[PDB]
Amino acid sequence: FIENGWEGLIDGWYGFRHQNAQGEGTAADYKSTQSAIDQITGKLNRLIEKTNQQFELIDNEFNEVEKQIGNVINWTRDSITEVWSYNAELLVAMENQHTIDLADSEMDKLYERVKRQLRENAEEDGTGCFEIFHKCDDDCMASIRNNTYDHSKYREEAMQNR
Amino acid sequence: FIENGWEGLIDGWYGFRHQNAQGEGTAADYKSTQSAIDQITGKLNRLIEKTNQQFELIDNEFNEVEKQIGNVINWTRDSITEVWSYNAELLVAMENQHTIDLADSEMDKLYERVKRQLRENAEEDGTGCFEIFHKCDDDCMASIRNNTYDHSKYREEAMQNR
Amino acid sequence: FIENGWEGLIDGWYGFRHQNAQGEGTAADYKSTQSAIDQITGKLNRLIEKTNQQFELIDNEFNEVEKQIGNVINWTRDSITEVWSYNAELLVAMENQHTIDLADSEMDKLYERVKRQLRENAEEDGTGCFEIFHKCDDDCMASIRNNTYDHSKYREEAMQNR
Amino acid sequence: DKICLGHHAVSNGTKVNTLTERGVEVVNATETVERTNIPRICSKGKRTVDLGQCGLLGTITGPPQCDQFLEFSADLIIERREGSDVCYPGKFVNEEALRQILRESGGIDKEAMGFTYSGIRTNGATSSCRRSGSSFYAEMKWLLSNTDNAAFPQMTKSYKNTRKSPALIVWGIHHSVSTAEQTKLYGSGNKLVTVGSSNYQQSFVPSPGARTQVNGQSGRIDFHWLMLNPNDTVTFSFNGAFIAPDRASFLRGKSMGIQSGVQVDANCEGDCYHSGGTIISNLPFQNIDSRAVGKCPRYVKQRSLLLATGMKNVPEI
Amino acid sequence: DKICLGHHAVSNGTKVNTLTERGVEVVNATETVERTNIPRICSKGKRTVDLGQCGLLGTITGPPQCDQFLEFSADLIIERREGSDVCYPGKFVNEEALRQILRESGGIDKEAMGFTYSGIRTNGATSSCRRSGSSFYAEMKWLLSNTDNAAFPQMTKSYKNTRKSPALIVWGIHHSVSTAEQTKLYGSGNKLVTVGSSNYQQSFVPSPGARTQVNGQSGRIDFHWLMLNPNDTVTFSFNGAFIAPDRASFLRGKSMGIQSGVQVDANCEGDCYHSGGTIISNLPFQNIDSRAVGKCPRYVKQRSLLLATGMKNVPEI
Amino acid sequence: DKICLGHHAVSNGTKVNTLTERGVEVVNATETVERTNIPRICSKGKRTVDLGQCGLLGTITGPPQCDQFLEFSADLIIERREGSDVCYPGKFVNEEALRQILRESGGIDKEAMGFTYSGIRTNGATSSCRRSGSSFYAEMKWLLSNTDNAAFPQMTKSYKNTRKSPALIVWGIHHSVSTAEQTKLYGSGNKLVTVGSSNYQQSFVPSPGARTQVNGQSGRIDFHWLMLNPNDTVTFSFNGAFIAPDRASFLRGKSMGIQSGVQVDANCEGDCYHSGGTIISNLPFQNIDSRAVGKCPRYVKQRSLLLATGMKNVPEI
Ligand SMILES: CC(=O)N[C@@H]1[C@@H](O)[C@H](O[C@@H]2O[C@H](CO)[C@H](O)[C@H](O[C@]3(C(=O)O)C[C@H](O)[C@@H](NC(C)=O)[C@H]([C@H](O)[C@H](O)CO)O3)[C@H]2O)[C@@H](CO)O[C@H]1O
Ligand SMILES: CC(=O)N[C@@H]1[C@@H](O)[C@H](O[C@@H]2O[C@H](CO)[C@H](O)[C@H](O[C@]3(C(=O)O)C[C@H](O)[C@@H](NC(C)=O)[C@H]([C@H](O)[C@H](O)CO)O3)[C@H]2O)[C@@H](CO)O[C@H]1O
Ligand SMILES: CC(=O)N[C@@H]1[C@@H](O)[C@H](O[C@@H]2O[C@H](CO)[C@H](O)[C@H](O[C@]3(C(=O)O)C[C@H](O)[C@@H](NC(C)=O)[C@H]([C@H](O)[C@H](O)CO)O3)[C@H]2O)[C@@H](CO)O[C@H]1O
Ligand SMILES: *[C@@H]1O[C@H](CO)[C@@H](O)[C@H](O)[C@H]1NC(C)=O
Ligand SMILES: *[C@@H]1O[C@H](CO)[C@@H](O)[C@H](O)[C@H]1NC(C)=O
Ligand SMILES: *[C@@H]1O[C@H](CO)[C@@H](O)[C@H](O)[C@H]1NC(C)=O
Numbered sequence A, B, C: 001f002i003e004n005g006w007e008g009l010i011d012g013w014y015g016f017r018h019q020n021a022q023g024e025g026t027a028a029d030y031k032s033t034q035s036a037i038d039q040i041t042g043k044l045n046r047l048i049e050k051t052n053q054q055f056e057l058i059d060n061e062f063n064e065v066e067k068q069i070g071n072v073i074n075w076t077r078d079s080i081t082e083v084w085s086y087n088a089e090l091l092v093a094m095e096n097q098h099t100i101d102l103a104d105s106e107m108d109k110l111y112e113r114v115k116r117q118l119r120e121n122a123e124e125d126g127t128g129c130f131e132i133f134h135k136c137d138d139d140c141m142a143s144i145r146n147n148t149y150d151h152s153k154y155r156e157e158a159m160q161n162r
Numbered sequence D, E, F: 001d002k003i004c005l006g007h008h009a010v011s012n013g014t015k016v017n018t019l020t021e022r023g024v025e026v027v028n029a030t031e032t033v034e035r036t037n038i039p040r041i042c043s044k045g046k047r048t049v050d051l052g053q054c055g056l057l058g059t060i061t062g063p064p065q066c067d068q069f070l071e072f073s074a075d076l077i078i079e080r081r082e083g084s085d086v087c088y089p090g091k092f093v094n095e096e097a098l099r100q101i102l103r104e105s106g107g108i109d110k111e112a113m114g115f116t117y118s119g120i121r122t123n124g125a126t127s128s129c130r131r132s133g134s135s136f137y138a139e140m141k142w143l144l145s146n147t148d149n150a151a152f153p154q155m156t157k158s159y160k161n162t163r164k165s166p167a168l169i170v171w172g173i174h175h176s177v178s179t180a181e182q183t184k185l186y187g188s189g190n191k192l193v194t195v196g197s198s199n200y201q202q203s204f205v206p207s208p209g210a211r212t213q214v215n216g217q218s219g220r221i222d223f224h225w226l227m228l229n230p231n232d233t234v235t236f237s238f239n240g241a242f243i244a245p246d247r248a249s250f251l252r253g254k255s256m257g258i259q260s261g262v263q264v265d266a267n268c269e270g271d272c273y274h275s276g277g278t279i280i281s282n283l284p285f286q287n288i289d290s291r292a293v294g295k296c297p298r299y300v301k302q303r304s305l306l307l308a309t310g311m312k313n314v315p316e317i
């Protein structure tokens, strides 16, 4: 992931992509994907909310109101327009920054989860991959994916190979 | 901590809970607790601040003002009310997100502090605990708590046991 | 870095400071510095933006307008003034928090980059330094700085010395 | 052996803006500023009246165009550009305040005031208000002398609001084409029309003179109004040049009034209206009309503000 | 051996809202929207006047109810619903502007204008303003002819503001019950009251006629006012139907005026007032009264907005 | 052997505020609230007129001070405290609305109305408006009787706006020092000046009486105005005490008007003006003048709000 995303991962946001001896495989992680999705949809639900405040007419586009009260009305409306434009752009920008950052944070959560899940039986290549120093067939990879990998089974062999 | 908080930790926010041979013990960490407390109270002091701006009457609830100027006044007041409601809800939500996130960040700071404090004499079980591969009595635990644990004393024995 | 900044680093924001056998040296890292600089300047460009909205006079400081419309105008202007003061202080505070936090995040990015770059050939002293357990002359240090350090060359010697 | 972590991406991401950059590429994004307009007045499920050629104020005085709107009842009131408050040329003092009152009145409810008259005429008419023949405002009475140049007896009429809501009272001063015509109608001398209540004291005088030719007439009729409190009494003391009220107007309930030039559509439902149609949207902001009324998203200057709904899109190198 | 890190929790956490979720459980939280009201006017340490039955404008003209308020001095002014600006029925043109002026005036300071009169009477009174017997506004003079139906000499009076602050000038036109009574008081003919200054030119005429029966009278008194600049002179040219000013009003300092129906309490201190009491709060927002005045937290629609003051509360499974 | 990571610092950092702390030390910071003012009217590249002693409204009526401003054309209009709309004492009804109209008019464009007169005089003058001798407003006509005490024939004049933009019409009622002088000028009897159009019906009467001594005169001239729609006609029906309009005013384009007491500087360029100078700034906020106009940063209460442009400054222990 360090500087590349997987365009082939078309069934999820995050996931595992491995290769051992039976070939190269790719699957999607459901937990982190659902976490990020739930947070983003939380934002959407927050920002779509309907305002129940009703405003009625105070000027007239058929018979123009008196000039002084009309300029005061226009002045106030333009001021409030500036306020809501500022609030809109600032809101969208801030929410975007927090969204990207929270996605990155979820990726880091998954990666660190796998790191502590493998213990001393692997090393960090530096680009989001875990070099496993022992035989890890598809059942071992799927044991890492479903969060059931036991590091004690491969400890002697992994450290011995390291 | 990974998915559980300690209801027994009733004298602090964060802390250490260990068990070795003399039994099971629990104590509270003062530094991180005071950091989070100081940040939150900083927020409180920021958000309680008194507004020194005085507003006086511009309408009348005993003798209703003229209808046109009254509708302009009501229109403006309702607009400003919408603005302040938006600012209030958005402020509270954002501050809550940043508060929870900063508490999590403090927990991570403490955990990583202990991790680099133990060096190679321990491993990460994956749920916020450090498996120490050597005898660590109450003086050693208290040496980790007060940030005085020397890893060179147990290095040969810890690595040899690992 | 843990509790100290380098006043001597006068040619960059972040950087490497090492010592091995040829003495003690200090150089600046360009990538992280340019990242933080580009983000901060992004903030500046966002917050300097010109407002293209023109507001004209609605009262008169030579001949005072009628008293009622004058009090409504003053009331509205003071309300909008409160709104913009709140938005200004809140904006500056939030942007400052995010700025400091993003600088810290960049420092962590660089540190973790070096950590995964050295693999098993070093340890974390706990104050932002990497204890290298093998001979690492100026060419090796400069190999870490330009992101070309190969850990396989020193693996046997580093682990053997550890 | 090796296992790797990663995230998704696409060759077709969308650009958004953040605190630190303008135009980063994210996987997915959605719009927050509404630009789609429905060019109709979505009035599904709302009691609507289309004033059409009848001006809103006319419904109180009742020119011919408003004959079908003398006691309307609505939740949504629509004004049209072809509307007209008058048939005989005239205008309302504080007209826009009265319009803003009637827009949210939920309709009006007329009630006879019971003004009986002694030695005058009460059937003054004109060709500008044609109902079969020369007619007048349906809710008003054009009082003048009996024959011609005859005197107008100084009269006083009173009306008590025997109901629980304020009563909209509307009368009219007649400014003739000349003092000679003012005498031909109400007799010689400067006429005075004083009006009093428990919180009202205004007084009026006719202004005879030559004016333009609006609707074929050079005279004018000033229309004045006041709100009557419950158990309060209005008093009209007059001696000529007076368009007397025949019926009072009581506000029915509550409603909302808009001005539009598009047709009514009872097929779509909307709460945010402007003159060009209806803003049916759940977005928090809109860039269609700043003077939109109802329950609307906030107007903003920007035409588009893309909110990121996905992660950063790093292309597969 | 093992050492563990962790955080605290409780079985009784509080729900708050964030950017991404609605209703997460945190350890501790505090309220930011104030709903507690103190149903009194907290005026501890403030020079307060309770106008009571005296209307604010009355303090300038001085009906009997305002006899104790002719030269008041206050930091906080309280209007009451039972207040009344008049004894003889009448009202003020631009009344609310004058009210907003007097609310922040810090009190008033009367000063004699020195209007001496020639061949008329200056002791006109009535039973609506009873001070022992039939009386009148304490700061005004009811000028009429000497006997009955007698002529009113065309008079001109002038007053120079010899002070450094604007002088509040208030006069009154008398609209009689009829032209016959207008003649009985000031003589026949249409009377004219013109008023001039260095930035004022209005003119007025009486409006005799029959009106309602407010306070037992059918006549009315229009009250008009203007602010006089330093070294500027006001000129009154009149010929009848004129309530002349006896004393000018000078603004003392600065203050703030509220309208309330609750009792004064000098035991609590507050800067944010509304009609229902005082909002003593340090919270940034309030949901009690949108028209609250003084130094208040901002009004918001929401009744509660819980700010999280603790970490996330993960229950001990 | 050892390699270390770190960041920079300085012994001279700047304090800023954040969400959690007030006054943390950062490496670098910049200001967001502008306090620097340029005490001149930066008008580089703008068509500017400095009204100087000529009041803005005067440009429509044309007192001597405005003789050079009868048909000005500008992008930026500057009012001065020494300005004056009148020479003969008077004032404008709805004066500030007319000022706000003329400030953004881009200048004015006069055009003769073609009012020809029969049996009266049209050369009424005064010493308050001195152009060589006793003169009058350059755009007006002082109509009175032929000799003295002579009658004023009831006249009617009309003007059609044959252009595509509204025509600013301004007339004047003359309030004499007395009814004796009103007769000396326009004859006996109460004069009436009625004005009509397609959306205007006001009427006026003179108010003779004694007033102060502004510019040496005790009489006054009320100045009234109305906007004429294209193809619409104004009608003046009068019988004395009437300051007739000689030329109409048509708005040229668009502009912006400010009030200032500082000198013009064509060397600097600015869009944000106030009475004290020009706010040349790119900062988002300003704390100089809340009533600043043009394209300005938002006014805020605070004098300074430091935005952090660097990391946290941890001193080298
Ligand atoms: C076309 C033109 O310029 N010629 C006018 C001429 O119109 C005007 O006479 C008025 O003409 C209109 C129609 O154009 C009406 O016929 C006016 O008469 C009526 C009306 O129907 O409005 C007759 C009616 O019986 C009258 N009603 C009452 C209650 O008195 C009214 C009434 O007199 C006036 O409306 C009140 O001002 O008028 C007719 O007067 C003449 C008048 O001088 O001027 C020509 O130039
Ligand atoms: C009860 C009812 O409907 N009957 C009225 C009757 O009141 C009214 O006469 C007026 O009655 C009031 C009291 O109800 C006063 O007695 C009025 O007289 C006084 C007053 O005290 O106000 C007497 C006083 O001497 C007068 N003062 C001066 C300076 O002239 C004033 C003055 O004339 C008027 O107030 C000015 O309008 O009045 C008394 O007039 C009669 C009148 O027609 O109508 C019955 O229906
Ligand atoms: C100085 C003082 O208090 N004395 C006044 C005295 O001024 C005033 O007479 C007026 O005095 C002024 C100058 O001070 C003018 O001389 C007035 O005459 C003129 C004018 O020039 O304005 C003469 C001119 O021919 C007249 N024009 C026309 C078209 O009629 C006008 C005109 O009569 C008036 O301006 C309209 O009100 O006046 C002169 O009247 C006397 C008047 O009573 O009062 C002294 O106290
Ligand atoms: C107020 O703005 C509208 C357009 O939004 C414009 O039509 C109207 O003329 C303005 N009012 C003025 C200039 O008095
Ligand atoms: C303005 O709102 C108040 C309530 O806040 C209401 O009593 C008053 O009637 C309104 N003004 C109008 C409808 O003109
Ligand atoms: C409005 O505020 C200005 C100062 O900003 C002040 O000079 C003016 O008098 C105020 N208007 C009033 C009090 O009506």
Ligand SMILES: *[C@@H]1O[C@H](CO)[C@@H](O)[C@H](O)[C@H]1NC(C)=O
Pocket (backbone or CB within 6 Å): A044, D028, D029, D030, D309
């Ligand atoms: C993008 O976001 C919108 C709104 O959140 C959603 O309706 C849409 O399905 C999303 N697109 C994809 C491809 O998920």
Ligand SMILES: *[C@@H]1O[C@H](CO)[C@@H](O)[C@H](O)[C@H]1NC(C)=O
Pocket (backbone or CB within 6 Å): B044, E028, E029, E030, E309
């Ligand atoms: C919760 O927060 C409030 C305000 O910050 C504080 O007064 C209170 O003591 C806190 N509660 C606990 C149990 O700490």
Ligand SMILES: *[C@@H]1O[C@H](CO)[C@@H](O)[C@H](O)[C@H]1NC(C)=O
Pocket (backbone or CB within 6 Å): C044, F028, F029, F030, F309
């Ligand atoms: C501090 O920031 C300002 C504005 O971003 C910049 O112009 C200035 O050069 C900076 N100072 C240093 C020492 O970099």
